[PDB]
Amino acid sequence: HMIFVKNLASVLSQEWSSTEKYPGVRWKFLIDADFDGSSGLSLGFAEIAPGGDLTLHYHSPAEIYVVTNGKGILNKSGKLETIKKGDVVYIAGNAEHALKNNGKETLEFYWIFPTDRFSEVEYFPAK
Amino acid sequence: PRGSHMIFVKNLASVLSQEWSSTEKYPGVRWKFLIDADFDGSSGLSLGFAEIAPGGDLTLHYHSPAEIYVVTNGKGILNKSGKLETIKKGDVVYIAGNAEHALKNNGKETLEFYWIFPTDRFSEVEYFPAK
Ligand SMILES: C=CC(=O)OCCC(=O)O
Ligand SMILES: C=CC(=O)OCCC(=O)O
Ligand code: NI
Numbered sequence: 400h401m402i403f404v405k406n407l408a409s410v411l412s413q414e415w416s417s418t419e420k421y422p423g424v425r426w427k428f429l430i431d432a433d434f435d436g437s438s439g440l441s442l443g444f445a446e447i448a449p450g451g452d453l454t455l456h457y458h459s460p461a462e463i464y465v466v467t468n469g470k471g472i473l474n475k476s477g478k479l480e481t482i483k484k485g486d487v488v489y490i491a492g493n494a495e496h497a498l499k500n501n502g503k504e505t506l507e508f509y510w511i512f513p514t515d516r517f518s519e520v521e522y523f524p525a526k
Numbered sequence: 527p528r529g530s531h532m533i534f535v536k537n538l539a540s541v542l543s544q545e546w547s548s549t550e551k552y553p554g555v556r557w558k559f560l561i562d563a564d565f566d567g568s569s570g571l572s573l574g575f576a577e578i579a580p581g582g583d584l585t586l587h588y589h590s591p592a593e594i595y596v597v598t599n600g601k602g603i604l605n606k607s608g609k610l611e612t613i614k615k616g617d618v619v620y621i622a623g624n625a626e627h628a629l630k631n632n633g634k635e636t637l638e639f640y641w642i643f644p645t646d647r648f649s650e651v652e653y654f655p656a657k
């Protein structure tokens with residue numbers, strides 16, 4: 400029956416994760432079985448630099464974004480909609496989605512998966 | 527129309543027509559549902575938004591699904607099954623399934639946060655009082 404609090408300061412020593420497939424995008428893990436032994440939900444924090452783009456993709460689990468700073472263009476399987484600080488996004492499982500930062504300030508958000516860990520979630524490129 | 531691959535965006539202004547929920551058991555607490563099968567047809571995860579006024583108290587309780595808090599405004603005291611720890615804007619909280627927990631706003635600003643359940647809908651979560 401664990402309960403714990405976490406913020407970005409708590410994971411300072413965790414190096415930013417990144418990948419060439421998503422330019423200007425980086426992320427850290429805050430609630431994750433591989434880090435904390437938590438289960439049922441897992442949560443990370445992502446930063447998209449201005450001009451950064453998380454390209455079009457999907458994964459089987461449903462997913463939530465909580466947008467904490469900036470603004471961006473969300474690609475909803477081909478339909479664009481602007482998101483910004485204070486928005487939440489629901490992304491059904493296997494729904495193709497993309498997010499690019501078209502602003503001057505950093506696009507920041509948490510993501511949530513109904514999985515114990517991020518590493519079990521399989522990303523696939525959209526057709 | 528919303529299908530099994532729905533993607534949508536919400537904020538408080540989106541749910542203006544939804545009345546704030548509250549209860550005398552949790553004085554100074556009110557909430558709305560933002561991502562929820564019963565309102566949106568969504569599944570797998572559900573999310574609401576809660577505000578605790580100064581002096582408000584969400585009292586000690588548990589439920590079988592794990593839960594996450596995303597604190598977005600103010601300062602609170604989290605009851606971690608007996609331990610009192612401060613949480614504030616910018617924190618996230620993980621609450622294991624069946625872990626007893628409470629949340630109190632001992633500050634002078636509104637304590638605001640999202641909660642997330644690994645459920646289709648809030649309505650399926652059974653709440654139990656503190657043992
Ligand atoms: C740093 C971001 C990342 O790994 O992507 C998470 C967001 C998503 O699943 O679309
Ligand atoms: C009425 C209380 C409420 O919705 O709180 C949700 C957070 C929790 O279940 O601890
Ligand atoms: Ni995704």
Ligand code: NI
Pocket residue numbers: 587588589593627
């Ligand atoms: Ni709870």
